[PDB]
Design a binder for this molecule. Sequence first.
Ligand SMILES: [Mg+2]
Ligand SMILES: [Mg+2]
Ligand SMILES: [Mg+2]
Ligand SMILES: [Mg+2]
Ligand SMILES: [Mg+2]
Ligand SMILES: [Mg+2]
Ligand SMILES: [Mg+2]
Ligand SMILES: [Mg+2]
Ligand SMILES: [Mg+2]
Ligand SMILES: [Mg+2]
Ligand SMILES: [Mg+2]
Ligand SMILES: [Mg+2]
Ligand SMILES: [Mg+2]
Ligand SMILES: [Mg+2]
Ligand SMILES: [Mg+2]
Ligand SMILES: [Mg+2]
Ligand SMILES: [Mg+2]
Ligand SMILES: [Mg+2]
Ligand SMILES: [Mg+2]
Ligand SMILES: [Mg+2]
Ligand SMILES: [Mg+2]
Ligand SMILES: [Mg+2]
Ligand SMILES: [Mg+2]
Ligand SMILES: [Mg+2]
Ligand SMILES: [Mg+2]
Ligand SMILES: [Mg+2]
Ligand SMILES: [Mg+2]
Ligand SMILES: [Mg+2]
Ligand SMILES: [Mg+2]
Ligand SMILES: [Mg+2]
Ligand SMILES: [Mg+2]
Ligand SMILES: [Mg+2]
Ligand SMILES: [Mg+2]
Ligand SMILES: [Mg+2]
Ligand SMILES: [Mg+2]
Ligand SMILES: [Mg+2]
Ligand SMILES: [Mg+2]
Ligand SMILES: [Mg+2]
Ligand SMILES: [Mg+2]
Ligand SMILES: [Mg+2]
Ligand SMILES: [Mg+2]
Ligand SMILES: [Mg+2]
Ligand SMILES: [Mg+2]
Ligand SMILES: [Mg+2]
Ligand SMILES: [Mg+2]
Ligand SMILES: [Mg+2]
Ligand SMILES: [Mg+2]
Ligand SMILES: [Mg+2]
Ligand SMILES: [Mg+2]
Ligand SMILES: [Mg+2]
Ligand SMILES: [Mg+2]
Ligand SMILES: [Mg+2]
Ligand SMILES: [Mg+2]
Ligand SMILES: [Mg+2]
Ligand SMILES: [Mg+2]
Ligand SMILES: [Mg+2]
Ligand SMILES: [Mg+2]
Ligand SMILES: [Mg+2]
Ligand SMILES: [Mg+2]
Ligand SMILES: [Mg+2]
Ligand SMILES: [Mg+2]
Ligand SMILES: [Mg+2]
Ligand SMILES: [Mg+2]
Ligand SMILES: [Mg+2]
Ligand SMILES: [Mg+2]
Ligand SMILES: [Mg+2]
Ligand SMILES: [Mg+2]
Ligand SMILES: [Mg+2]
Ligand SMILES: [Mg+2]
Ligand SMILES: [Mg+2]
Ligand SMILES: [Mg+2]
Ligand SMILES: [Mg+2]
Ligand SMILES: [Mg+2]
Ligand SMILES: [Mg+2]
Ligand SMILES: [Mg+2]
Ligand SMILES: [Mg+2]
Ligand SMILES: [Mg+2]
Ligand SMILES: [Mg+2]
Lengths: 121, 118, 116, 48, 221
Amino acid sequence: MIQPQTHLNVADNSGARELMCIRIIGASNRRYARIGDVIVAVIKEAIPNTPLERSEVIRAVVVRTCKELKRDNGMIIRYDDNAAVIIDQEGNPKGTRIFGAIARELRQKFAKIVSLAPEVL
Amino acid sequence: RVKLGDIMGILNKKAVHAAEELRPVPGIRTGDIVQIRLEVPENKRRLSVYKGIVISRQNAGIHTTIRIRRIIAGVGVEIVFPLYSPNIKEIKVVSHRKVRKARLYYLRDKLPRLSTFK
Amino acid sequence: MKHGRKIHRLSRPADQRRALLRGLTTQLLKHGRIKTTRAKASAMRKYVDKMITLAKEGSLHKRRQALGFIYEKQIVHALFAEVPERYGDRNGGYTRIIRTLPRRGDNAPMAYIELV
Amino acid sequence: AVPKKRTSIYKKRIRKNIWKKKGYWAALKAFSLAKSLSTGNSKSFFVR
Amino acid sequence: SVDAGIGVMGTKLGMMSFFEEDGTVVPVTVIGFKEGNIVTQVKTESTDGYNAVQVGYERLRDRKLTMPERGHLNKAGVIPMRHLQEFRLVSVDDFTPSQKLLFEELFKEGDMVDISGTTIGKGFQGGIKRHNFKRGLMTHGSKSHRALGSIGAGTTPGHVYKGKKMPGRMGGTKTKIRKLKIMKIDTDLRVVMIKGAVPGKPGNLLRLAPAKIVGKNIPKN
RNA sequence: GACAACUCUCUCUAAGGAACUCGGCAAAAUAGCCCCGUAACUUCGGGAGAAGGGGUGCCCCCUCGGGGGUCGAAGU
RNA sequence: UUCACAUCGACGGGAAGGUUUGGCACCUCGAUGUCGGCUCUUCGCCACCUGGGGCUGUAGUAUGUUCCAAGGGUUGGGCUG
RNA sequence: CAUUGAGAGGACCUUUCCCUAGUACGAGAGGACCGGGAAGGACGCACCUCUGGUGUACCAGUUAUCGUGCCCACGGUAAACGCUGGGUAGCCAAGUGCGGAGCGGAUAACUGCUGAAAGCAUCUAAGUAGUAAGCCCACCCCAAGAUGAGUGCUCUCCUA
RNA sequence: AGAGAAGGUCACGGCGAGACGAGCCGUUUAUCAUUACGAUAGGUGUCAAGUGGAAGUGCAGUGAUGUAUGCAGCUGAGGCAUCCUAACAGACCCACAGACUUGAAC
Ligand SMILES: [Mg+2]
Ligand SMILES: [Mg+2]
Ligand SMILES: [Mg+2]
Ligand SMILES: [Mg+2]
Ligand SMILES: [Mg+2]
Ligand SMILES: [Mg+2]
Ligand SMILES: [Mg+2]
Ligand SMILES: [Mg+2]
Ligand SMILES: [Mg+2]
Ligand SMILES: [Mg+2]
Ligand SMILES: [Mg+2]
Ligand SMILES: [Mg+2]
Ligand SMILES: [Mg+2]
Ligand SMILES: [Mg+2]
Ligand SMILES: [Mg+2]
Ligand SMILES: [Mg+2]
Ligand SMILES: [Mg+2]
Ligand SMILES: [Mg+2]
Ligand SMILES: [Mg+2]
Ligand SMILES: [Mg+2]
Ligand SMILES: [Mg+2]
Ligand SMILES: [Mg+2]
Ligand SMILES: [Mg+2]
Ligand SMILES: [Mg+2]
Ligand SMILES: [Mg+2]
Ligand SMILES: [Mg+2]
Ligand SMILES: [Mg+2]
Ligand SMILES: [Mg+2]
Ligand SMILES: [Mg+2]
Ligand SMILES: [Mg+2]
Ligand SMILES: [Mg+2]
Ligand SMILES: [Mg+2]
Ligand SMILES: [Mg+2]
Ligand SMILES: [Mg+2]
Ligand SMILES: [Mg+2]
Ligand SMILES: [Mg+2]
Ligand SMILES: [Mg+2]
Ligand SMILES: [Mg+2]
Ligand SMILES: [Mg+2]
Ligand SMILES: [Mg+2]
Ligand SMILES: [Mg+2]
Ligand SMILES: [Mg+2]
Ligand SMILES: [Mg+2]
Ligand SMILES: [Mg+2]
Ligand SMILES: [Mg+2]
Ligand SMILES: [Mg+2]
Ligand SMILES: [Mg+2]
Ligand SMILES: [Mg+2]
Ligand SMILES: [Mg+2]
Ligand SMILES: [Mg+2]
Ligand SMILES: [Mg+2]
Ligand SMILES: [Mg+2]
Ligand SMILES: [Mg+2]
Ligand SMILES: [Mg+2]
Ligand SMILES: [Mg+2]
Ligand SMILES: [Mg+2]
Ligand SMILES: [Mg+2]
Ligand SMILES: [Mg+2]
Ligand SMILES: [Mg+2]
Ligand SMILES: [Mg+2]
Ligand SMILES: [Mg+2]
Ligand SMILES: [Mg+2]
Ligand SMILES: [Mg+2]
Ligand SMILES: [Mg+2]
Ligand SMILES: [Mg+2]
Ligand SMILES: [Mg+2]
Ligand SMILES: [Mg+2]
Ligand SMILES: [Mg+2]
Ligand SMILES: [Mg+2]
Ligand SMILES: [Mg+2]
Ligand SMILES: [Mg+2]
Ligand SMILES: [Mg+2]
Ligand SMILES: [Mg+2]
Ligand SMILES: [Mg+2]
Ligand SMILES: [Mg+2]
Ligand SMILES: [Mg+2]
Ligand SMILES: [Mg+2]
Ligand SMILES: [Mg+2]
């Protein structure tokens, strides 16, 4: 349930420490980013001397919410923080290595991302 | 011959005996460290293994629910399993923790140490 | 709204309504019959029966639970004496409510609640 | 908000008659109640 | 509003969860039945002006029914019933007064139904709750909050419009929920499980018809 | 008595956290005590309770603060 | 590129509307009062999108212009009285 | 009791993506019309199985203090919960379902077929054919105070 | 004029109905013996559910406290049973075979 002005942690190498979400995309006029949605964020805090400068406008996909994802098993999933992964407009992650768990719900639109994951839920 | 309120309760008891027949379900309470094995609709090869502590158990009928908390790669994950689900294969109690509540929701605000397993 | 909210409010806040009911039941057990407003009566049923059903068992536990409801000890002990005698066979339903002429001052509907 | 005009005699008589009709239903309850206490058979009712 | 096929009536018993082999949980309303669903009367185009069949539902003690009604069910040769309803068909040849309907013969599995019932009464409700009015500002200076807003334009037109949305009574009405699905029929308990919600709390009275699809089940116009 | 809308005095609210608005207006937050630590700047008095951090209940034991135990999700 | 009329259209002319800046002083002066937001509508069409078309300097994709069409839609912020 | 429906309203909205097919089209680069399929958005109608919010019905911890003779244990107060941690029913959404169907009717623009007035031509004068998120029926609620007060089934009209 | 038609209102017990009116359900609570229809509310008994391990008495400990008795104790706005209380007593309205004409039938 990411929405504009929400702050996020980044899940990969890409050298952004923190993102502020400004827009949800592809959802038409929706206000809610949930897992698997592309958001336009900006960089707030960066990891120094990295290809990414703060105050950059970038795309990222939301891989973790504190809201709850519902599969068809009746299974539910809730993380402790919000996080996204910074991508290209191709679906390829800019940074090459991902932290944290992800879901099998991303397997359709993003292959790379499920691949680089340390754990899958 | 069955009166109606009876019908509503009865259908749950039928469902649960029907499900406990195929797959007997363990005595499972709050504060129980637990290992679960899911049959995922994708990957026939390996049935997913979720470890973790039980923070809550909501009893209702066929849909009785268990909430497993675990720290994974530094990110706290809680998962909610319907207990009688066909997609669960094996479930067992690894260990038992001594707890004074019915729901440990306070495990979010505590340190990661307490959610760390395996 | 209220659907399925079953409680009697008696137009008092929670604290006062509790204390009211404690009071009214110590009165009922002390005098055996009393005159009140139909609302207060209908509300008071439940707690009367709670005390009676309580004293049917008699354990130090139960007795402590009654002492912490009723105001006057003496009445409680009297209960735990009398009740096994007087109510032993009656399975529930220990109160009669016999309604009367309304009050002159406000036209509040009255009633007579009896310990049966 | 105020009354731009003064209410005409007849309309006022109709509204007050409406308020007087409640007396009619009260008189019916009262009558029925009297005929109930006038047999001395009611165990739900009490008078002193 | 000519209705496709005969429907039956039933009682809403409340909802539970229902698994499928692959572990898909569908929430289902459980619709029970009672002694009834008996054709009461049949109305011919000639006699009544149109074609319809009146089914009775709930049984009842005899006393509770009124003399006119009891006479109405004595003409049929049927047991006393609480609720009567009418279904409106295009062809009534299959039905005779006193005939009985079985919901097991009119409804298979994977079939589409339509559930009519009465809604939960929420009483007298404000503008917010009844029409989804946005509430005004809670804090900086503002005295409005849950209030209705302005109700019209200025000197012209100089009166409020008809149908202008306002607080009044909400709920408690005949509602129809289109295109539902029947998950499982239980013969033992004579119950039907339907995927999703139907109006009203348990102990309601429902009407189930086979779904009206505006192209293919109904007269074109 | 009843427990509608709505107004007012109040308590709480999932995810987010000023996106509200003329304006963080109003609310929420902080808070005692002991201990460590404390900047630019200066009329050398200040700034300063700067900031920021730790400790805190109840039992025994020792010295006249320290150690050991023990409950609770939480100890001014 | 040829070609006034795909698209522009100078010099001039003929209109409609009553939303701009105005003229008038018929209007109310006692307490018939201007611009923005909130809430809440509603209507017009000179059509921004969505439905159907004609012409193109329309290969295709995308346009351009115009015809019918007002059923629905018309975001969230930084900035300003 | 059950209904017909004059009239009145609500709703008939929209975006990507995938087959068609990398097919027509073009030297290439680019890349379709038409018709099928899914997922979304907004909006509407419900609903409480799940996830929750509240829940001054309840349950537990716990501070100060006054009661119950004192320990124990409970009760009061700390406005309209002392402060916290949970919560069933209700109500509710962020949760769950469902909806937007029509080889129906008549048209606007336009495209047409037969075809005269003007032995040629012309979509028009006769007569007709396609066709729009528009118009009207169908969908959903209301509805005979529709004083034009409808139709249907049954019931009741005692005693002197 | 007596009486009280069918039905209605009131009364009385209620509600998932309700600002009030209105709506809906009840009003001796069956019999059964093979279905179902005769439990409205409260109480009582049991069940789901919540909370999370009662008091008392034992043991361990210098003590705060832990542990056994015990899925305990409290609660149970939800179900299902059972007439134990209250649905007692009753009251009011209400009964010109449906004015008049014209055809048709007999
Ligand atoms: Mg739950
Ligand atoms: Mg008052
Ligand atoms: Mg208090
Ligand atoms: Mg009770
Ligand atoms: Mg009826
Ligand atoms: Mg209601
Ligand atoms: Mg708003
Ligand atoms: Mg205010
Ligand atoms: Mg006027
Ligand atoms: Mg009040
Ligand atoms: Mg307070
Ligand atoms: Mg919040
Ligand atoms: Mg929070
Ligand atoms: Mg938060
Ligand atoms: Mg923050
Ligand atoms: Mg701002
Ligand atoms: Mg700012
Ligand atoms: Mg703004
Ligand atoms: Mg302030
Ligand atoms: Mg404050
Ligand atoms: Mg504080
Ligand atoms: Mg300090
Ligand atoms: Mg300073
Ligand atoms: Mg501190
Ligand atoms: Mg400590
Ligand atoms: Mg020209
Ligand atoms: Mg003048
Ligand atoms: Mg004035
Ligand atoms: Mg136009
Ligand atoms: Mg267009
Ligand atoms: Mg065009
Ligand atoms: Mg081109
Ligand atoms: Mg339009
Ligand atoms: Mg319009
Ligand atoms: Mg518009
Ligand atoms: Mg109808
Ligand atoms: Mg019509
Ligand atoms: Mg009219
Ligand atoms: Mg219409
Ligand atoms: Mg349509
Ligand atoms: Mg090709
Ligand atoms: Mg298409
Ligand atoms: Mg859709
Ligand atoms: Mg729920
Ligand atoms: Mg529930
Ligand atoms: Mg809570
Ligand atoms: Mg709840
Ligand atoms: Mg004392
Ligand atoms: Mg206390
Ligand atoms: Mg005091
Ligand atoms: Mg005070
Ligand atoms: Mg007070
Ligand atoms: Mg609380
Ligand atoms: Mg939905
Ligand atoms: Mg035509
Ligand atoms: Mg042409
Ligand atoms: Mg010719
Ligand atoms: Mg021709
Ligand atoms: Mg013609
Ligand atoms: Mg057509
Ligand atoms: Mg159309
Ligand atoms: Mg369409
Ligand atoms: Mg009529
Ligand atoms: Mg007439
Ligand atoms: Mg009668
Ligand atoms: Mg009435
Ligand atoms: Mg009543
Ligand atoms: Mg009676
Ligand atoms: Mg009962
Ligand atoms: Mg009941
Ligand atoms: Mg004990
Ligand atoms: Mg206690
Ligand atoms: Mg000892
Ligand atoms: Mg339990
Ligand atoms: Mg019985
Ligand atoms: Mg009795
Ligand atoms: Mg006659
Ligand atoms: Mg005559």
